[PDB]
Amino acid sequence: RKTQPYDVYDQVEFDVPIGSRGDCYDRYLCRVEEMRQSLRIISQCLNKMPPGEI
């Protein structure tokens, strides 16, 4: 979404979680933080939905 964006992903702001050890704990933390960042993106999308045809 950051390196090769598609649709309107270049117009939303979010962080990308990064691990340190390459284990299951780091990936679990990454997924939780990704859930939080998805909430962030959803708020932006709710406040920025334009009119027009579908």
Site residues for another protein per CB under 8 A: 36-37, 39-40, 42-43, 46-49, 51
CB of 48 to another protein, least distance (A): 8
CA distance 42 to 10: 14
> Considering beta carbons, is residue 4 or 53 the nearer one to another protein?
53
User: Long-range contacts: 4-12, Cβ < 8 Å, 24+?
Assistant: 11/48, 12/41, 12/44, 12/45
> Considering beta carbons, is residue 5 or 42 the nearer one to another protein?
42
Helix or strand run (H / E) with residue 33: helix 24-47
CB of 9 to another protein, least distance (A): 18
